[PDB]
Amino acid sequence: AEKPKLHYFNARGRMESTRWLLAAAGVEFEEKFIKSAEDLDKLRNDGYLMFQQVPMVEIDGMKLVQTRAILNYIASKYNLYGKDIKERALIDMYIEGIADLGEMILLLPVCPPEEKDAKLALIKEKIKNRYFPAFEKVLKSHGQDYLVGNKLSRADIHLVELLYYVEELDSSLISSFPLLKALKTRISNLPTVKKFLQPGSPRKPPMDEKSLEEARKIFRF
Numbered sequence: 001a002e003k004p005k006l007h008y009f010n011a012r013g014r015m016e017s018t019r020w021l022l023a024a025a026g027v028e029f030e031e032k033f034i035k036s037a038e039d040l041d042k043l044r045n046d047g048y049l050m051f052q053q054v055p056m057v058e059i060d061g062m063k064l065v066q067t068r069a070i071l072n073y074i075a076s077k078y079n080l081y082g083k084d085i086k087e088r089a090l091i092d093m094y095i096e097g098i099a100d101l102g103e104m105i106l107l108l109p110v111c112p113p114e115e116k117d118a119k120l121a122l123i124k125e126k127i128k129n130r131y132f133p134a135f136e137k138v139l140k141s142h143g144q145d146y147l148v149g150n151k152l153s154r155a156d157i158h159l160v161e162l163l164y165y166v167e168e169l170d171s172s173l174i175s176s177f178p179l180l181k182a183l184k185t186r187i188s189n190l191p192t193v194k195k196f197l198q199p200g201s202p203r204k205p206p207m208d209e210k211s212l213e214e215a216r217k218i219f220r221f
Contacts, residue, residue, distance in 0.1 A: 004029040004074075005058040007043060009215060012204040014067050014106070015055045017161060019203065021071060023196035024157045025078040031202060037218055068099075075154040082148055090148050094138070094155045101131045102162050105169065109207055110221070124173060127166060132177045135159060139179035145186055152190070160187040168206060 004022065008015035010033040022029050034040050034054060044052045048063045056063055057070045060077075064070050075081035082088045104123050111119050138147055147155040163184045166173050174180055187193055196203055 002058070002060065006031045007034065007048075007056040007058070008054050009034050009219075010204075011207060011211070011215070013055075016204055017067065017102075017158060018055065018057065018070050018074065020157055020161045020196065021074050021080070021154060023201065023203070024152075024190070024192050025074070025080060026192045027074075027078065029202075037220070040219065071154065080152065080154040080157070082153060083151075087149050087153075091153055091155045094135070094147055095158045097131060097134065098155075098158045098162050101126065102158075102165070105162075105165055109212060120169075124170060127173050128176075132174065132180060136177045136179050139183060145183075147183075152187075156183065156187050157193075160184050160193075 004027065006015055006018065006029055008031070019029075034043070040054070043049050043054070043056065049056055050063075050065050053065060055067055055070060056065045058064075059070075059073065062073075064073060072081070082091050101123075104119075104126070108116070108119060108123065135147075142150075144150045146152055147159065159180075160183060163174065163180060174184075188197055195201060
């Protein structure tokens, strides 16, 4: 069948959570990297970006845009979205909290230099007092290896991905959350995830200053 094709910059950005989910699901995919404003213009002018933005993923005959639409489809297609409407409600609640926190961290590099320190301190405060306690509480409530249904779901993948980003920010933030640490280890040892974390996979590195200032001028943000 058609192999999914991921259109995005050669960077983490708003495509990385899709790379994680597909890799975790054991699904082969291809990437088509946007290297210039001309590359992006061609996708727009040819009509393949509904809202003139990437990410865009070609899958099952669709040219899907909007990260949440892409992830929702992939999760359902590969049975990572729970078994019933109520499990999806828990999954959605969990992963939307993850996306809120992930959004903050995703946009810190583009923070005005004078608002940087305050923004970072707020992110760390919410991690220690709001989000990490919330997910530790879920894991402690049922004591099982997975967030929902005693079965791997997108929620485990999205959360562990975020845990790696929180580690990059500050290794100490997770220190008082032993169940989150255990989740990170177990999920990282799943064969598909273990391979994705090893070198040479589609997993992308953190944005460096040299690469940011480059695409910053090339793509007008």
